[PDB]
Design a protein around this ligand. Structure first.
Ligand SMILES: CCCCCCCCCCCCCCCCCC(=O)OC[C@H](COP(=O)([O-])OCC(O)COP(=O)([O-])OC[C@@H](COC(=O)CCCCCCCCCCCCCCCCC)OC(=O)CCCCCCCCCCCCCCCCC)OC(=O)CCCCCCCCCCCCCCCCC
Lengths: 36, 69
């Protein structure tokens, strides 16, 4: 019969955290700093 | 959008392989060079009959210079 309010809240918080973590997985334009 | 690939640290395996290759080559390139130089400059012997009144040394019964040495 759908999510409970506690389930909705936990899922939303985990979703925001997971999306932030995935956003942090990107590489800045200079990330592969290759030594000479 | 390039992403970061999570991998185990491959520095140590690569370093070990580099060290093993370096040591094996350091000891083997001179060996191969010397073997080639001996082969092209000091060839093998020939099967010749024992001359009359001559007893050869025990190392004169082999044909490869390295084996004789
Ligand atoms: C690498 C790191 C990674 C980790 C490593 C892990 C492993 C660790 C290993 C540790 C050490 C290993 C132990 C082994 C020690 C054994 C040494 C030994 O006894 O040497 C044996 C042997 C030497 O025999 P020998 O008893 O000393 O000589 C007897 C003869 O009297 C002599 O004959 P000769 O009087 O005619 O003289 C010929 C002479 C000279 O011959 C020539 O130069 C002529 C060649 C033809 C070219 C002609 C044209 C070129 C120039 C002409 C053109 C210019 C002028 C015209 C221009 C025209 C312009 C168009 O060449 C030679 O002397 C032979 C080569 C010597 C090599 C010895 C190797 C020793 C290595 C020991 C340490 C190993 C460490 C690794 C490092 C190795 C090195 C990087 O060497 C060889 O094995 C030669 C290879 C022959 C194979 C031919 C290929 C046939 C393939 C058949 C199989 C097909 C199936 C597919 C398989 C394919 C696979 C290849």
């Amino acid at each position: 019969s759908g999510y409970t309010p506690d389930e909705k809240l936990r899922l939303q918080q985990l979703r925001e955290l997971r999306r932030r973590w995935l956003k942090d997985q990107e590489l800045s334009p200079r990330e592969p700093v290759l030594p000479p | 959008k390039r992403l970061f690939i999570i991998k185990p640290s491959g520095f140590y395996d690569r370093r070990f392989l580099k060290l093993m290759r370096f040591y094996i080559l350091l000891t083997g390139i001179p060996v191969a060079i010397g073997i080639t130089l001996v082969n092209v400059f000091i060839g093998e012997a020939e099967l010749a009959d024992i001359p009359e009144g001559y007893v050869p040394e025990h190392w004169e019964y082999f044909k490869h210079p390295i084996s004789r040495w």
